[PDB]
Amino acid sequence: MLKPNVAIIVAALKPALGIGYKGKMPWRLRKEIRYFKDVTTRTTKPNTRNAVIMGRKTWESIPQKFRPLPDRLNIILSRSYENEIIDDNIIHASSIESSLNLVSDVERVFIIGGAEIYNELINNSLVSHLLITEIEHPSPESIEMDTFLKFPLESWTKQPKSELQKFVGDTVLEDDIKEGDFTYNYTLWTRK
């Protein structure tokens, strides 16, 4: 695949954009996990699938029985990896671009974490869209977090809900979803 558009998908707590604590997500939002699954799996074209890219630490954090993530081509980056196809669902690479040279029949590509991957790849011009779930809490300071997005958002534009809707196709997008004390909304951002 040559120079595909790539999207980042992440869930973050406003206003600091925290995304983790001691190697895990600081919340369990059930409807948000379901959204992540639908957006990253669904395709429109026939014989295609989407690819998900993750850092080695994220891959190793999935219980072995639950990997690879089903119904998507899994790409794992490590600076120590050779560019290799493991099987039809797993690719190892040391760079995003190298990895995409190994794929065919992919419709969309999503970066799914973690923090080091996000913070480095935001500055790669292949990244064209950010799917950020903006999480809000009455007392964000009470939530322990050690990992944060370092995104240059002054260079990106938040689009209207209509644009997100068109991006995700059929997926149901509810507004101000509440689970416990958290309220969240799905957003789409593109480069200015």
Ligand X SMILES: NC(=O)C1=CN([C@@H]2O[C@H](COP(=O)(O)OP(=O)(O)OC[C@H]3O[C@@H](n4cnc5c(N)ncnc54)[C@H](OP(=O)(O)O)[C@@H]3O)[C@@H](O)[C@H]2O)C=CC1
Residue numbers belonging to the annotated binding site for substrate: 32-37, 72, 112, 118
> Running DSSP on this structure, what letter comes out for residue 112?
-
Q: Which residues of 119-136 are buried (b: 16+ CB within 10 A; e: fewer)?
A: eebbeeeebebbbbbbbe
The total number of residues written for the chain in this structure: 192
User: According to the binding rule CB under 6 A, does residue 58 interact with ligand MQ1?
Assistant: yes
User: According to the binding rule CB under 6 A, does residue 80 interact with ligand X?
Assistant: yes
Cis omega (within 30 of 0) for bond into 46: no
Judged by beta carbon, residue 7 or residue 11, the one nearer ligand X is: 11
Minimum CB distance to ligand X, residue 3 (Å): 17
Which of 109, 141, 85 has its CA nearest to residue 8? 109
Token reading at 15: 């206003």
Positive or negative: CA dihedral 173, 19, 142, 60: positive
Selected range binding ligand X among 9-17, 65-73, 169-177, 184-192, rule: CB under 6 A = 9-17
Residue from 14, 16, 24, 48 in contact with ligand X (CB under 6 A): 24
Rounded to the nearest angstrom, the gap between the alpha carbon of residue 69 and the centroid of all alpha carbons in its chain is 13
The residue count for binding ligand MQ1 (CB under 6 A) is 12
- x/- map, 103-142, ligand X, by CB under 6 A: ----------xxxxx--x----------------------
Q: Which residues bind ligand MQ1 (CB under 6 A)?
A: 9-11, 32-33, 36, 58, 61-62, 112-113, 133
